[PDB]
Amino acid sequence: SLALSLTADQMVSALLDAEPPILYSEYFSEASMMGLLTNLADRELVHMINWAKRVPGFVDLTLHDQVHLLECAWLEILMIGLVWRSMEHPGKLLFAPNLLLDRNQGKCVEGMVEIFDMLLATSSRFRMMNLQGEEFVCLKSIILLNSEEKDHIHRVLDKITDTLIHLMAKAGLTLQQQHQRLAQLLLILSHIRHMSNKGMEHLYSMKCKNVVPLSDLLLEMLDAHR
Amino acid sequence: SLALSLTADQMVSALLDAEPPILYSEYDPTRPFSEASMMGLLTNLADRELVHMINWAKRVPGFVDLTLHDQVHLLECAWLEILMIGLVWRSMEHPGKLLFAPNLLLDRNQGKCVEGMVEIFDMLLATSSRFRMMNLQGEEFVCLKSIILLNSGVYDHIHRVLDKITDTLIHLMAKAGLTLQQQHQRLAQLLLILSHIRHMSNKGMEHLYSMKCKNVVPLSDLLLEMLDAHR
Amino acid sequence: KILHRLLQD
Amino acid sequence: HKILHRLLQD
Ligand SMILES: CN(c1ccccc1)S(=O)(=O)[C@@H]1C[C@@H]2O[C@H]1C(c1ccc(O)cc1)=C2c1ccc(O)cc1
């Protein structure tokens, strides 16, 4: 289709144009903290769904497969988003412009500080690598698609790999440096998967509780992980 | 360190030579499978494999440069991923089956013996099929398994070593005649599969914990400590 | 499901 | 110390 016909620059400009906005929270307790994060995540999810439909090749897939990918990837995607916008805030997670939290504030919710530490370490890694905006949007698309239809998804994934390499070569990196940086970035996705799985385990634990109301959409996404 | 001065070919030779042996299970054909007997078999196998895993890890270039605490951390984080990539690798030439051991070759219907296991069995079968389709090479496999060991708990020495293993992967692909574009595409395909192996390990760990809390089988003191590291 | 509706638009 | 810690030394 026309997704595979895109140039590298067009792929990058397309992903850049599709970027969701940075939402504000409604900034205490286990209940308050979870309230804020849940409300935020819920609003973000609506933008994520419309962002995915702008990821080249995604709307080519069956609605079944589109649903499956988002159900699998939504926390990874929220997390890579969070790590990206926290890059220039060492030791802090920028959940929202008006919600800059540190690891101590993550102690308010049980088991959350462990994830906070992992997210912080991921942000620190991106900061050290000097991750670029154009690289971030490629990685985020890879998370969506990775986490004749299965061949189509793989064809699009190769295209995004081509796009990442293009950005690196354009940045002046040697061939050896390109391959090394590509590997470094993709291995971070293993860590993002790990964090999502751990966090999801807490979510469908705090659910069985009724700690906070969590929304119908969130409840349905969460339910897919069980 | 020493790892940083190895050539690609030297890296590959090191990793191939360090390969653990393939072990047999204590499978007893005189009695039918139960959830308990199945779990007992797998637990006993994994436990014996862990001891050889520890010897293998000490032969992965750069690993012994780490403090004992860091070595413990990496193996605690990675052990099930490592058992899993081994399983998927030796199962490649057995479509639809998982070769846990030469005398323990199972299909998904046998996985149904244990609550929650067939879902992971299906993911492992799929990963094996994916490796088969990509024609994963043994040289590539040992590189990936070493990457799992160094990467999964890492969040500068470790990163320098990981960079060397990337160099080695690309070198292998070039030697096999892949075009330069095919090389970075394959590198990416293989590393994305590591995210699925992470996923499988996490799901499996959750279930392993569930089983321990239900007293289905006695876990070894070692496995208890490895398992506890994830909780 | 809700996700299915949001996508189908 | 952990068992793993011990086995890493042997
Ligand atoms: C799900 N997590 C969790 C951990 C402990 C207790 C409860 C939830 S988590 O992984 O720490 C997750 C990361 C970040 O903090 C949590 C969390 C969250 C997401 C959805 C939700 O309904 C509730 C919370 C976070 C979050 C929220 C919005 C973002 O854009 C990025 C991350």
Ligand SMILES: CN(c1ccccc1)S(=O)(=O)[C@@H]1C[C@@H]2O[C@H]1C(c1ccc(O)cc1)=C2c1ccc(O)cc1
């Ligand atoms: C831990 N898993 C599990 C899932 C559901 C119920 C019980 C265990 S699992 O992910 O399926 C895991 C994969 C493979 O089957 C399980 C399992 C296992 C590992 C340790 C243990 O004490 C018991 C079993 C497997 C295994 C065992 C040895 C290998 O070389 C490779 C894989």
